[PDB]
Amino acid sequence: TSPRNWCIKMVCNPWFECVSMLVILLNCVTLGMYQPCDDMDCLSDRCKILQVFDDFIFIFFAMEMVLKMVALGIFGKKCYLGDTWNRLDFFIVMAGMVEYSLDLQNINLSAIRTVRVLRPLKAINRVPSMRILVNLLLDTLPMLGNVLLLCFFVFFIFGIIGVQLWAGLLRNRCFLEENFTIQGDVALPPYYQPEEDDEMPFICSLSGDNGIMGCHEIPPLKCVNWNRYYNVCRTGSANPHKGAINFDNIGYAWIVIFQVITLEGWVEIMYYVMDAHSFYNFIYFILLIIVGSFFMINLCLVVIATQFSETKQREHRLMLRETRAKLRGIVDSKYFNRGIMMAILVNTVSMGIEHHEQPEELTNILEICNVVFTSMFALEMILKLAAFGLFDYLRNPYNIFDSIIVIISIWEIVGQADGGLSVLRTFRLLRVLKLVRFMPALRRQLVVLMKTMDNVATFCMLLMLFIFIFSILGMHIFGCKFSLRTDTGDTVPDRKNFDSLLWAIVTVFQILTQEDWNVVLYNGMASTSPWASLYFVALMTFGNYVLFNLLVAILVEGFQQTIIAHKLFDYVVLAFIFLNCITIALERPQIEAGSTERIFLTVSNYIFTAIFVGEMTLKVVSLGLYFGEQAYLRSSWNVLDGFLVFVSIIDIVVSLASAGGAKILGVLRVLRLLRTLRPLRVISRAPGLKLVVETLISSLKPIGNIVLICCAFFIIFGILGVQLFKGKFYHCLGVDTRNITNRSDCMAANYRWVHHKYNFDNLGQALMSLFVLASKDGWVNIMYNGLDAVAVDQQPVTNHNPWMLLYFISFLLIVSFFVLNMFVGVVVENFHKCRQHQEAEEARRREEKRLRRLEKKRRKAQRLPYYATYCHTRLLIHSMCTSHYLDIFITFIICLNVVTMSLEHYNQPTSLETALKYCNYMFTTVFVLEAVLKLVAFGLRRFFKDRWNQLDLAIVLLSVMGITLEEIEINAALPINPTIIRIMRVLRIARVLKLLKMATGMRALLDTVVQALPQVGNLGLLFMLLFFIYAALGVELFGKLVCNDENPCEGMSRHATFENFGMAFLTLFQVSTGDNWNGIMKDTLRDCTHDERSCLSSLQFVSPLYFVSFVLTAQFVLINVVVAVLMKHLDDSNK
């Protein structure tokens, strides 16, 4: 109409969307300027100007809203409320109007002002690529409810189990005696805490609750041992982490289960529970890890990738002067090119050598060699411009980059006054990048990565929008509420605060990477309210388990003589190797010299070596050592077996050479390390594992180029870190660590000059610190050291140079991009091979599948025995009482059961106890009723043929078993062990399993997982083998590492030390989960008090290599498990 026609031209004008983006970004800038610490009631200048700015922003938002209503209509498809984001704009408009009205009404109510944080989200609609991507995500969300139902199942089951086991157990601190007598000056706290303010609480074990740490393990204070008076412990206090880690409610149990889904703070709460209730809760926590933290979030990855696959496909289916020429000859010689490669490579090596406290001669050699390299590069400059001409030299921009490098180097040499030595020397690293001009594979790989980034960029903007929104939300709700209290005369703010958008964004990025996100979880749950954990739950879930899986999907679909008998010899030698494994898992560094088991271990080594040399001889006489083709050493596995048996022989020889063992103890160490390497022939002696290892290697070449590029970036950033941080990672750890600046001040105080184990002095230490950074573990402390670092021998000061956040976070982003590229390369590599196999066997498989549709035709009507029950008083039972009208009742009763179990907590009302008793009676009675109903509906044939009525009968049998024991405590018929009652209650949870019948999506998805168990099981066996090998190897390397007060541990707390074997298997699992693995490797590399050779040994060479290699192999194995699940899911999508 005419009124509509007046404004449609302006509304449809792209100038309107341009000014919409302008004001959206201006609104983002206005939201970013909030200073929660300083903007107190907005009694400041910038507060007032920002209020005016936001006022104008809301005025324009209201104006554009009314313009679009009066130009497009309301409440219709063509109308304004047609697109989703228009409704969102209306939502912010309404919320802002409400906030403005309450501002007029003089009602502060700082909770609707916390809707401003949603205003940046409007930028999604006013960007085409962003709008398409977000619409695709919103369309793939409704198909994610299945894995969200899996999430609910394996959160609720573990929440019920946790609340039923450890309801309030975490609270029992160790108190003084009940009637305590003190002469005077009562300084004893009511209970015992090792650290101040219950930072590391002392959760005991109750009398009857067979924990481990039971108040007789108290640290003897070292006068009078005041600690021994903490005798009895009772369940009344605040519970650990300022009341944040407990199992009282089911919300708190869900918080803890989430904390172990993200694999952060796993061990701390694990040992909290072990202290509280029982040592055997490791089954609970390890099962939760394996099920949730790996089989859930990676099923989330699989589901998002798949759903985005056919959601891309669905939308896609809707559409569907004479010397100049002579001087060139020297250039294109293919050997001069290699000579300049060698020059550049040795220049890189020269830049890598520099370290802290250089010898005076060494830096001179470095600068002279720099001059030589700059002279050679300038010679190439002048040569190529002459022999080619100006245009030809400038035709290729690689030569332009070379000229830039030469100019910068020359200026650096010339600029010997100031400034040049600070930046241009740091710019020397550009010469490393000249290799791209030469390596042919790293051109194609880099171009492919840029082709990917052609799709990543919009998703990067989406991620930045998301992180900005949540950083603003954090500033709003956590501003000035994270203030750590006074310890030196002032309440210094926590480093992971939310007081400024710089710190807000760094903290939100840190939370997304899952490093010390539990600390901010606790300090935001103990400051505002326990409901503040929803902030972190939403942040982590949308970021990691939705958005990052979305990016993975984006990339994946962007790409897409003597007699010989060999009947059971392999199987029997596999059994022998397993027995060898059993005796390898025993060589703990705790056996007394000459003990009974020591002799057994020696003789077992001898007999196993005899068996292996026997099979060696059998194989070689069957084949021949190297005597022609088809010999013993013509396969990789046979060569490995030969190497292992030869190592065992030479180790036995050296052991028999024990007489005069000096100077060969290192040789014994090396032979023992290879002895740990020994249990690896199971791969050779098994077909499935051998095939899987072959496939794992075949899936490593396609990502080999990306691995080389990422190692090159590690070297580049290592040299950069060496430049930036040389002697700056030294601090005076002492009583004060205050009012002191340089090391001379510390030596005046005589505290200590502590040298961090993670620092950038050498390039090897820089590379180890960079690997710790790039594993998104322990990287926050490294970053804090970087920002704090000041100079060679003075105290780092807090946030001295925040600009180094760029280094420490750009490294994380580049390594993350390369890791996602390795993951997608592995996925697409498996895709090709599995696709071929599919074609072939599935063509034959779709022949028999039409044969199976003919089988259903056959199925037909075999006079189904409904008549036998019809008119037999079951005329209603078989049909009218087995229909979906009767099973909705079962599902409703199950949901009521779920919400009843979700009500148990600590100190619950006894009235509520009896209410749950009656509800449980109701549920059990109706379950028995429906079991009888189906039993009379049909006879014993389908009773076991259904295979699900079996499940219902098992559930009702367990239920009636549980309820009967309750009556025993009413009539006091017999004293029943409370453990049996606990088992019955904790296994009442099995009534959830009946939801699996109607959740046909659960059946489909879990099945799709199930027919991946060939590959998943084989990789799991390989992964257990990796744990075995690396655990034995760690037992011998780090076994003698004593954990005590004299050696204050950081990562190996109580049962994670490498002392025994199993205590090393636990810590290898903990490293595999990436929880405080860097801490553990900090414990391993540690100069001791000369009490053992291990600290003073070559552990610096092998411990970082140990941990790095284990982390890499574990991650690769788990990635290939995920990939196998993904390809089986896509093959199921084919069928």
Ligand SMILES: CC(C)CCC[C@@H](C)[C@H]1CC[C@H]2[C@@H]3CC=C4C[C@@H](OC(=O)CCC(=O)O)CC[C@]4(C)[C@H]3CC[C@]12C
């Ligand atoms: C739906 C969830 C999973 C994602 C959406 C995130 C936010 C919309 C929610 C999740 C966490 C909630 C916060 C949890 C904690 C806080 C502090 C909490 O503490 C207070 O009572 C402060 C009272 C005051 O400041 O006067 C009040 C609710 C609030 C603001 C909540 C506001 C709304 C939040 C940020």
Ligand SMILES: CC(C)CCC[C@@H](C)[C@H]1CC[C@H]2[C@@H]3CC=C4C[C@@H](OC(=O)CCC(=O)O)CC[C@]4(C)[C@H]3CC[C@]12C
């Ligand atoms: C399947 C096999 C090839 C690998 C897995 C074997 C482990 C499950 C078993 C085999 C030997 C067992 C170890 C045998 C010896 C020890 C030392 C033992 O501690 C002590 O002897 C000191 C305390 C004391 O002496 O009473 C604790 C059990 C432990 C770690 C056992 C942990 C579990 C182990 C490693």
Ligand SMILES: CC(C)CCC[C@@H](C)[C@H]1CC[C@H]2[C@@H]3CC=C4C[C@@H](OC(=O)CCC(=O)O)CC[C@]4(C)[C@H]3CC[C@]12C
């Ligand atoms: C390639 C990325 C994925 C990981 C790189 C792993 C290794 C190549 C790095 C990590 C740990 C580094 C080692 C860490 C410790 C040292 C410091 C330095 O040893 C010293 O302290 C010298 C003084 C002395 O102890 O005598 C020699 C380099 C070295 C072996 C480093 C050599 C290079 C290592 C093995």
Ligand SMILES: *[C@@H]1O[C@H](CO)[C@@H](O)[C@H](O)[C@H]1NC(C)=O
């Ligand atoms: C440190 O220096 C300050 C200077 O202001 C002084 O007041 C203080 O007594 C010194 N010592 C300690 C332990 O703080």
Ligand SMILES: *[C@@H]1O[C@H](CO)[C@@H](O)[C@H](O)[C@H]1NC(C)=O
């Ligand atoms: C180190 O700090 C002290 C503080 O008393 C100062 O006097 C001195 O100049 C500083 N620098 C040195 C010792 O090189």
Ligand SMILES: [Ca+2]
């Ligand atoms: Ca982690």
Ligand SMILES: [Ca+2]
């Ligand atoms: Ca951590």
